[PDB]
Design a protein around this ligand. Structure first.
Ligand SMILES: [Zn+2]
Lengths: 248, 76
């Protein structure tokens, strides 16, 4: 079929079927404080987590998702959530990955990808390499644990000289910073500067997630989940992240 | 051609690939060196999630690119 449909929705054919399927869904919602929360059902929470996250980070969308996100916040998550499932080739009922979903959605954030940058420096026995990341790549950042301590200095091995190397963030200017865990949940303190986080509990093959923001936990299933500064985080998000360095 | 992968724990490994290689091919190559099941793998290039049916070419992935291997989560 047509591709000014497949390209206006940002989905290939297979995913567009799933999208159409999921448009039949009705997602009940309620407010808790200033956050719109989807009622839990059918392995919902990876959808819910991302939605609370986006609200905490005051995110807006461009394209089709602009009005889909507006409709959700006005009380009708159908169009937005449908795209969410479709983007991850998932059917309602499926358990899945909030960071996968967030990376899909981030492509369509109404955000300053034009001017976003990270300046970095890697040191090894080869010498010292300075380099720069820009746009969306600069904003979405894999880390071992989701706080700035694990972001600003990362370590690996250099395949050329064989030495342990050190990759550090020297300067940053980003509309948002999205940290996501590379090896499943890792328990650390969150930064006070993080406007929101996602906590994952249980098996990574059969778990449950929820979002923390404004000193509260927003688990769309467990309504009495307790906020915890130190939690098994898979995600942390910062708004207008800016930093310029020093190291001596 | 050669690309780099940052593994679950941030190790740097090297893969030999071609632009025509599918994401599944790459996951299989990763499993060879790292012992991680394909269905436990999420591969990222420059912030973008890489999908099983597609090729390195489809994503404009060139030599000496770095991909990020991430543990896939399944929660509900
Ligand atoms: Zn080196």
């Amino acid at each position: 079929t047509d591709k000014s449909i497949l390209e206006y929705y940002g989905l290939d054919a297979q995913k567009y079927v799933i999208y159409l399927q999921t448009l039949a869904q009705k997602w009940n919602v309620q407010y808790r404080d200033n956050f719109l929360i989807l009622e839990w059902r059918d392995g919902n929470s990876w959808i819910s987590s991302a939605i609370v996250l986006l609200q905490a980070a005051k995110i807006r969308f461009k394209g089709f998702l602009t009005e889909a996100w507006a409709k959700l916040l006005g009380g009708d998550p159908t169009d937005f959530v449908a795209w969410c499932y479709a983007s991850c080739t998932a059917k309602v009922g499926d358990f899945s990955d909030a960071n996968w979903l967030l990376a899909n959605l981030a492509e369509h954030f109404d955000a300053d990808y034009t001017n976003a940058f990270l300046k970095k420096r890697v040191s090894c026995n080869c010498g010292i390499k300075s380099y720069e990341l820009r746009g969306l790549e600069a904003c979405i950042q894999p880390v071992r644990a989701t706080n700035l301590l694990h972001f600003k200095t990362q370590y690996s091995n250099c395949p050329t000289c064989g030495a342990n190397n050190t990759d550090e963030v020297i300067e940053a200017s980003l509309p948002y910073l999205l940290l996501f865990a590379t090896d499943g949940p890792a328990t650390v303190d969150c930064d006070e500067d993080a406007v929101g986080t996602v906590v994952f509990v249980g098996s990574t093959n059969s778990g449950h997630c929820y979002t923390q923001a404004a000193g509260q936990a927003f688990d769309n299933l467990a309504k009495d989940r307790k906020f915890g500064k130190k939690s098994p985080y898979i995600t942390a998000m910062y708004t207008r992240f800016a930093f310029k360095n020093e190291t001596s | 051609m050669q690309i780099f992968v940052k593994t679950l724990t941030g190790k740097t490994i090297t893969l030999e690939v071609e632009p025509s290689d599918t994401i599944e091919n790459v996951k299989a190559k990763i499993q060879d060196k790292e012992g991680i099941p394909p269905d436990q793998q999420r591969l990222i290039f420059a912030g973008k999630q890489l999908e099983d049916g597609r090729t390195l070419s489809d994503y404009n992935i060139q030599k000496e690119s770095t991909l990020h291997l991430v543990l896939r989560l399944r929660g509900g």
